[PDB]
């Protein structure tokens, strides 16, 4: 059982790294959109 628990923990950790990588990508795209809205607002005002 301890063994199956150990391999399950590795699969949860693997998934956590995939999630972390997805968040990093989202954060950068989100920062690009914030910059984009800023230039558009500055141009129309």
Smallest gap from Cβ 3 to Y ion, in A, equals 8
DSSP 1-41: -HHHHHHHHHHHHHHHHHHHHHHHHHHHHHHHHHHHHHHHH
Asked if 33 touches Cl ion (CB under 5 A), the answer is yes
Determine the distance from the C-alpha atom of residue 31 to the mean position of all C-alpha atoms in its chain, rounded to a whole number: 12
Closest-approach residue to Y ion (CB): 16
Smallest gap from Cβ 29 to Y ion, in A, equals 21
Closest-approach residue to Cl ion (CB): 33
Binding site for Cl ion (CB under 5 A): 33
């Amino acid at each position: 059982r301890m063994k199956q628990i150990e391999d399950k923990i590795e699969e949860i950790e693997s998934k956590q790294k995939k999630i972390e990588n997805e968040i990093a990508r989202i954060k950068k795209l989100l920062q690009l959109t914030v910059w984009g809205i800023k230039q558009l607002q500055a141009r129309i005002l």
